[PDB]
Every structure is written in C-alpha cells, then in structure tokens.
C-alpha cells in the first residue's frame, strides 16, 4: 500500500477492509462491486487493480484464474456471432500486443467493456467463500462497557452487510446477541432467552431486559451482592 | 456508494439517513426537498438520481411508478392547452431520442422544468410510509448514562422531524420522555406521570423531578440503597 | 438547507441558530446585523436572503411586512426631498421590472443601498420578541457533573448575549445561578443565598462555595452519608 | 465579527482574546504588537482597523483619542523640522481628501509609516489598565479534577502573559497557587504554606505536595476518611 | 527531519516508524518495500534517501555497504555478457560525472533501474536483524484498563507484522497473550494455559476466559474481594 | 510571533518549543540543525530568522556575538587564502551595502554559504548551555493516572531528546523512572530499588513491578487498605 498516492484511494481502502471482514461475495461487497461496475466504467487494467488491491492472495489467484476462463466463454460466443464480433481474449484480459498498457484499452468498444464488466462480476461471484476469515458474524462481541443497544446494532448492520437471506439473517443476530453478549447482559437475557412469546421481537425484548445495564443503577445493584 | 465522486454528495448522503430515519414523508424529508426542489433547478436525470440514491429500493419503485402516472396527466394537460404546449411524456420523464441524456435534458425550458418539479413533488408524496423502519420516535432511547436534559432534546429534534402535527407530537413527546427513559429516570418519572397538573408543561417538569440523575449525588443516594 | 453550496454558509448558519436561541432583537443577533449590515453592503435580494435563512417563518413575514411599511415611508420622504430623489419603492424593495434580479439590484447607488440599510434594520427591530421561544437565560441548566464555574461561565456568556440592559442582567445571572444549579451545588448555595454581603459579588460567592463540588473530596463525603 | 472573511482573521481573533483575559498593556498583547508592528508594516487604515477589532470599545474610544493628540505632536515636530517634514495630520490619521481610502493611504512613505507606528504604538500603550476586566491572573481557577501539576503550569503561564515585573510575578504565583487550588490540594498546602525554607522554590515544594492527588491512592485515603 | 518539504513525506514517515518497531526484515517492511519499488520506479538518488530516511544510522551503513558490494556483482555480469551490457558502477551507484545529480540519473534506461532495484532489495535484505530494537512482539503490554480482545487483535497484528513464519507466528501470539497481560486477566488466564483442549483455538479461549474483565460485573466481585 | 504568515511556520514553531524544553545543545536540537542546515541552504538572513525565532532573547544575543566573532576568523582565513577568497565579514554576516537585503543575499556562492553555515553551526554549539531552562529529564512527571508504561516511555524519550552520552542518559532514566513517579507506584518501586540484579534491565523491572497499577484490581486492593 505504498506508491505515495493512486488515481483514487478511498474506495480500494474500503473494499480492501471489506472483504477482509465481511468477505468476497458478502452483500456489502457485492453491493460496492454492483455500483462501481456500472457506474465507473472499466478496463481490464482496472479490473486487475481492483481485484489485486481489495482481494487477499489467495483469493486473487482464484479470481483472475477464473476470469480468464470467463474470457474464453465469451471468445467462444463472439466466434460463433453471426456477424462475428471483433473481441479476442487479447481485448477482454489486457494480455497483448494490442491491448497491453492503458492507452490501447482505453480506446476499447462499449461492446468489449461491458463484455469484460460482465465476465468479471460473474468471476468475482465464483471466488471461494471463506470459512474462517473474520466471519464478522460471530466476531463482533460486547465490549466490557458497552450499552446492549449500540452492540446489538452493531450486530446488525454487520448481519445486514454479511448474512444474504434476511431469514437466516434474523436467526443468526438473534442467536449472537445472546451469544456474544458480555455477562453482565447474558445474565438479562438468559431468563428471558427461549421464552419469548410470538410476534414479540426477540431482540427487542433483548433490549428491554438489558435496559440499565451499565448505569449508576445496575452498578449500586451489584454493589448491594458484593457485600451481600 | 462508490464511483470515487460525483458533482455533489453530502445532500445526497443527508438525505439518504433521513429518509431511512425519518420516512420519505417526513417534515424533515419534506422540508430538504422543498429546498432543493426550488433552488437548484433539476432536470428530469437529477430526479432521477437523487430519489434513486435516497429511497430504498421497493421505495424507489413506487416513486417511478407515480412519477410515470403524474407525466401522463400532465401531458393530458399539454394537450388540452390552448394553445397546445410542446412538452412530450418524452420530456418530462428524461425518456427518448429527444430527452436521453443530459446534455438533451440541459436543453429543457423551465416551462418543462418547472411541470417536472411539480410532478415529482407529488409523486415523492404518494409514497406510501413505512409502519416498520425506524419510526425514530420511538427508536430513540435513553442511554444508561445519558442526562435525561439531553435525552429529552434528542426527543424533540427528532418529533419535530418526523411528526407532522404539532398537536400529536407534543403528545408523542410526552409519552415518550417517560416510556423510552432509562430505569433511573423512570423512577422519578413514574410518582409524577399522569399527576402533572395544567398549564405546567409536562416535560418540563419531567426534566426537573430528574434534575440531579446521573451525578455524584445520585450515586450516593444509590450506594445508601445498596447496603440498605 | 439543501441546495449544495451557496456564496456564503457559515455566517448564515450561525445567525439561523442565534435568532433561534437568543431572539431577533438580542444583543447577540443586534451586534452581528450591525457588523455585517455596515461592511459587507447589501441589496434588497441579499436581505431577503438574510432574513429568509435566519428568522422564523413568522418571524419573517413579520420582518417582510414591516420593510415594505418602511418603504413607503422612504418613498413619501424621497418625493417630498428638493431636489427630488430617483429612488421608488421598486427599487428599495427589490420587486419590479427595473429591479428584479441580482444583475439589476448590482447597479444601485450607494443612496439606495443606504436607504434599504437603515429600513432593514429598523424593520428587524420591529421584529416582535419571542416570550417563549428558547429564552436562553432560563434554558441553561448545570449538567449533572459540570463544575459549577463552568456553568456559571456559560451562563454569563449567554446573558451577555440575550439581556441587554447590564442591570438587569445581573439580577438575572444571579437569579438564575442558584435556580438552575443541580442539587449538588444548590445544597451548597442555599445557605448562602439571599445572606450575601453587600460589596461583594454575589456570584463570585457562588464560585466560593461550590468550590469542591465534583472532586474526590465532595464524593468521600457524601458517602460518609451514604453509609450515615 | 461578521463579513464573511477579511484578508486576516486569526490574529485579529487572538489578539481581541487577549486583551480581554490578559489587558492591553500586557506583556502578550505588548509581544504581538511589537511583532506584528515591526513586521506587516501597517497604514493609518489598519491600526484603525487593528485597534477597532481588538479594544473593547471604551478602551478603542481611548485609543483613538490619543492617538490624535499623538499625531499631533509628530505635526508639530514635522513643521518644526529643517528642512520640514511634508506629512500633515491628515497623513498621519489617515483622514481626509489626500489620505482618505487604502489606495491613497497605500503610497506613504516609510517615513509617515514609521511615524504612525511610532504614535500608535504610544498611543497602546497610553490605554487605561483594567482594574476589573479579566485580571486572569485571580480568574484561574484550579478544576475538581485538574491535576495540579497542570494548575500551576496553567498560572505561571498566565502570569507570564500578564505580569510584567518578574520579581512580583514570582509572588503572585505563589499566593495564587495556593489560594486559587482547590480544596483538595489546598489541605496538603496548608501545612506548607508559610513554612516553605529559603533556597527551595515554592511552587516546586507545593507540586511535591499535592502529587498524589487525584490518584486511586488519594480516593482510597478519602474513602477511609468517609467511613471513618 | 526538517527541511521544510520533500516530494514526499508520509510513507518515508511511517516506514521510518516501521523499521523501529517491527525491523527492517520484518513482513511488514518487506512488503512496503515491494510495493514501492514495483510501483514508483526509482533511481539511485531515491534509493539513497528512501533508506537514508527509514533505516537507523547504523543499519543505514550496512546497507549501503552492501549495496555497493552488490553493484560490483553486477557489473561483473553486465561486462560479461555478450553483447555487453553498457552499464558501470557509477550508474548503479550513482556516483560520478556522469551520473550524479537526479537530473543525469533520470535518464537512466529501465534495463539501469531495474537493475539497480534488484540490487537494493538484496542489499536491504542483507541488513542485520535486531535482536534488541523495539522486539515489539514483546514490548506490547496489556495497558491496565484494555479490554482483552483489544490487546489480543493488537498482538497479533503485530505478530503478523514482524513475524514471517505462520507457524512460530502463532506460538507466540499464545505465549504472549498470557504472558503480557495485565494481573486482572492472568488471573483468569492461569487456570486455563496448559489445559486448552486441541482443536479449540487458544486465543480463542483466553478471550472467552477473560470476558467480562473490566466491567461493572468485575468491579463488584473485586470489591467483595477487598471487603472479604 | 504575529505578521499573518511566513513562507514557513511549522519548523521554526517546533524549534522554538525544542529549545525550551531541551535546550539549544540539547541531541534533539542539534539534529534539527543539521538536518535543515545541510538540506534548505541557507542564506545570512535566514539564520538571522531561524536564531531570532527559536532562541530565547538572552540566548540570541550570545548566538549573534559569536556569530560574528566566527566570522571575524573565517575572514581571516580567506584573506590568508593562496588564492585570496573574495568574502568579507559583510557578506558572512549579510550587513552592509552589498549585501544587505534577501536580494542581494540570494547571489552567494556557494563557497560563501557554506562558510557561513560553518560558522553558524559553531556559533551555535557555542550558546551557552541552560543550566536552568526546562530540564525535561527532570520536569516530567508522571501523572496521577497515567500507567507506568507510558511514563517511563516519555521519560526516555525526553532522555534521548536531552541528554547526549547514552551511559549517563541509562542512569538518568533509572534514577528518575523512580524519583518522578507517583506515589502509587513508587510504593511498588521502593522495595525493588537498588536489589535489582545485574543483567537484567532496570526500568524493565519497575515496570513489571508496577503492571497492573491504575486498573480494577488495584484500586480494589486500596479500597481493602481504606476499610482496614
């Protein structure tokens, strides 16, 4: 990360962080992918900054390995055009004698940009999901004195930006804010936990219970059961 | 949100947490887009966007959709004039050969550009409001250490941002100030609640019976409880 | 507020806030109308704007109403002068054919631009005072753990910005020192108050007796009470 | 303090501070009079300006009048010159049809510059010394909380911003460390106070007394003192 | 570190930090290097100070020790090909009449710079570990009211950092992440080293084992511990 | 430290504030000097400034004495040169009609900037050293609740800002690590001061006595020692 300074830094910066955390095919992620596709059109240069910059490795390797078999997909279909269609794998990689440095792609067809947009998103979509790296999900945990509201939203927005299916989503944010809550509030919840009636939202009534814990209140609390 | 930059951001993100936090309908919502409607004047691709990066997406879809029905009207209208005025469903949605992009739209008469502003003012006012997303007048919570003075202010801003009727949101307001207080709070509040008496506003005296939560003084009465 | 940027914020911005915490005809608000009003000369357009982003929209019409009364009296006076003077209520008020917009209103002579100074200002004094709305001097109250020379601090500085008669202002200060004091600090000044010598400054004693309050010393007292 | 922006805010800024907290005749204000004097040579419209924006407004109403009756002593030295000095009053205040505007005002010699820097800066320093304005050195105030350590350091600064005899500098220091500390620290000064030998310096014998305080070690000591 | 301004300052900055606490081999400094030497090409002159500026004085020699033993290497090859290569110490160096100043040595030919890179990046690497500079896989230390998992995610990020091999890497993690705990988690720490069941991630169970630490809940149980 | 702005501030605010808290022979002063002195050449007027502006008024004039006592040699030595050095003590000291202004002062070669950039530098190390001023080594403290670590840190940093002979520089540290400390540490330092075996580091010791002092569990302990 070093050169001094890019084109554009604050975008890669983020993705970079994103993907480390919420991974490749994540909701967040691919929501930034989906708005930087379409809006900042690119070249295949860009695509291998893009990738190479925001991607651990690893999981660039898997990712131009599979772009270059997207191209070849694509060179198969613009063969078999009726008119052909001028696109060779040359054009859609930015391998070649023709189409090498960013002055020769810039000059690339909307045709062949967008045929390279589309072969890139689905290659990114192919990039092995990770099992282990920072599966935020069941990483974010209660701070010793954090308020249960301000985690449990947390908790959220990273379910919102990690857990594709809202079902799923809900299950596992339910399951972590009891999981993953320090003790001070998972002995609220533990009573509560499991019974919660029908209709109901379970974190709501997460919140409810936990609702003083961390004041002056809870504190004289528990001052009373250290002496006592 | 990527694409590095575009011509103007800040509103667009502002409005974007406002609409999410207050609804598309609210004082404060409607408030911005007055503004911005009337001053800096839009063309049919600015509305485009700016409700496109604003609304959620099934909020976005209803937008369209009663926009697209308001330019009908109006062009029944052009149609109906005496004389005829030359301003096409073309010109009014951004849609054709004639009204595409923006150096077209840049083009348009402010007879055309005024009859857009009026159309989707009203179309932004058909959308239906949320009974779910963050109806913030009752999402806003005391926090554990939370002065209940700050609380309370934190309240109103945000009544006066969402609710519409000044009548209402006093009752709003008052209710709340007792239901979203913190535990410490509620018990000073609880002895006083219901027995205001009139004329004497009730969150001010709200605020006094809690004045004194949350210091040295309080914390001493409560350690006496603790042993006690 | 929206409409991206205009040729000046921040002193719009400060003004808005001032007229709604300290009132249009307070020392605060009189000073920077008196400031900027004598430097940075204005047409009858910037004064629209002026009060249009800082007053209250009652409170604007109001001033609006009010120009335009001074206006005509302008008008009568410019009529009956000898010579007579080229100036009509079209051009004081910035409404009509040869005086509509910023590139018309440009060309004023420093008569006219006068002329519309000194009727803004008196109109801005005709602005009827709020008795209601935030009236700072009563709103302030001690946060539960502000040290009380703070308080005080801020407390003077507002009145200062909103009392205008010196003598006065001090009743007010000293009055409103004990009566918006938290309960810490209240304990400490009733046994005081109303028994202040004269000579002596009647907060200064204020500052002396509440000098402790907040420290480790005042809080190992009260839990000698506590526990007492 | 409004306008916009002029072509130099800062200083204006700082300095309008202190002279409010430290005097006219201070030995800050002296300093940065001395530096800005010597420095950006200034015309007769910028001490007016210089002057205007940082003497409370009595103290400007004292300044100007001197600073006439100084130019008029330079006129009778000019007059009396051999050869004679071709600057007039006028010349020198910066008042009338050849020495009106900046532009005019622009074209003096560094002789009359000189001249009036020589009478302005007389005239400062003729400005009656506030027997009551923020005598800042009786205005700090040790905090609840504020190490003292960071007290002293606060006062000595103060004192050496506004005291200027370093000899009675030195005592005022030391009666105001302890008789502006709080009550915290003034219990461990007492004792000392008035018995502090000859040779070791008195604020360097209070510091070591007071260190300590404020700590966990002191709360314990007091929480002792509560049960106790 | 003065002189104003440079082309370039923060990375020179940061590495400059980087070599002082992780090590001028460390995985951290070895991968700036490589994305600042594949990235902005340099020149001898650049290299001169890019080490010059992030290398201790003393590291700094051995560096360029090396880097000239590593020119005469290559200029050994570049006179032994066939063709020869037309490039002499002096050019590697950049030393001499011919290429001294940045002015000559930008006119270097990529075969030159990339040459020289080469040879800058073994020479660096020959640079001696320290065995006693800032080690900071040992010198990060729980402060006294961290939150465990802070301090873990700050040891490993170090440990990723200055630690190559994966493997060591994380034996170190867990043998400092008991061994520089604060007293308040060792505590909670001691009774589970040694006993961690395989398959479980040690960290993983320090961090269950100290949660809570540092709340009110911690509080409490220590105050029945001094009452007790 | 008036005049708006210079075409630098930030170096000459860093090196007045190095000078009194190190002193002007102080390591971290000297390198200062060097660093700019052989990198923004300099002309006799700059040095002028750079003294003026970070030595204390009694400490410029001795730099200025010397300074030209220096060059009085170096005059000297180039009258006594074979061939004779056309630089007069006018144009080593930039006084005179030829070289007075930046201007003229701007045409030195580089003969005469060297020379006097010698001069300058021994005319430094000349100023005699404070015996007095700010003694950083002995005027940081440690704070009431800053942890050990972070004090001991400062404190060697303030070392190696201050005292040149590493040998004394360890002593020093060891000596003060102990006697500036507060009183909850010194208690653990005290029993451990002097019995520290060879080999093992001296500071490294007192702060492993000292972890864990300002967290919960030390604060419990006290709270047992204020009960019994």
């Given at each position: 990360?070093?050169?001094?300074?890019?084109?554009?830094?604050?975008?890669?910066?983020?993705?970079?962080?994103?993907?480390?955390?919420?991974?490749?095919?994540?909701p967040?992620?691919?929501?930034?992918?989906?708005?930087?596709?379409?809006?900042?059109?690119?070249?295949?240069?860009?695509?291998?900054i893009?990738?190479?910059?925001?991607l651990?490795?690893?999981?660039?390797?898997?990712?131009?390995?599979?772009?270059?078999?997207?191209?070849?997909?694509?060179?198969?279909?613009?063969?078999?055009?009726?008119?052909?269609?001028?696109?060779?794998?040359?054009?859609?990689?930015?391998?070649?004698?023709?189409?090498?440095?960013?002055?020769?792609?810039?000059?690339?067809?909307?045709?062949?940009?967008?045929?390279?947009?589309?072969?890139?998103?689905?290659?990114?979509?192919?990039?092995?999901?990770?099992?282990?790296?920072?599966?935020?999900?069941?990483?974010?945990?209660?701070?010793?004195?954090?308020?249960?509201?301000?985690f449990?939203?947390?908790?959220?927005?990273?379910?919102?930006?990690?857990?594709?299916?809202?079902?799923?989503?809900?299950?596992?944010?339910?399951?972590?804010?009891?999981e993953?809550?320090?003790?001070?509030?998972?002995?609220?919840?533990?009573?509560?936990?499991?019974?919660?009636?029908?209709?109901?939202?379970?974190?709501?009534?997460?919140?409810?219970?936990?609702?003083?814990?961390?004041?002056?209140?809870?504190?004289?609390?528990?001052?009373?059961?250290?002496?006592?």
């Amino acid at each position: 990360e070093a050169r001094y300074k890019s084109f554009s830094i604050k975008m890669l910066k983020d993705m970079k962080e994103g993907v480390k955390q919420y991974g490749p095919n994540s909701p967040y992620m691919r929501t930034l992918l989906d708005s930087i596709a379409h809006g900042h059109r690119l070249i295949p240069y860009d695509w291998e900054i893009l990738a190479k910059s925001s991607l651990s490795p690893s999981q660039f390797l898997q990712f131009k390995t599979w772009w270059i078999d997207g191209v070849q997909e694509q060179v198969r279909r613009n063969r078999a055009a009726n008119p052909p269609v001028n696109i060779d794998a040359d054009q859609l990689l930015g391998i070649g004698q023709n189409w090498s440095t960013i002055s020769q792609q810039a000059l690339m067809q909307n045709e062949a940009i967008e045929q390279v947009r589309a072969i890139c998103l689905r290659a990114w979509e192919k990039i092995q999901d990770p099992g282990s790296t920072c599966p935020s999900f069941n990483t974010v945990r209660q701070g010793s004195k954090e308020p249960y509201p301000d985690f449990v939203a947390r908790l959220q927005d990273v379910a919102q930006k990690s857990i594709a299916d809202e079902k799923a989503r809900k299950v596992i944010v339910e399951l972590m804010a009891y999981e993953n809550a320090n003790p001070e509030c998972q002995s609220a919840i533990k009573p509560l936990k499991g019974k919660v009636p029908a209709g109901s939202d379970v974190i709501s009534e997460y919140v409810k219970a936990c609702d003083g814990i961390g004041g002056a209140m809870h504190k004289a609390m528990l001052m009373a059961q250290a002496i006592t």
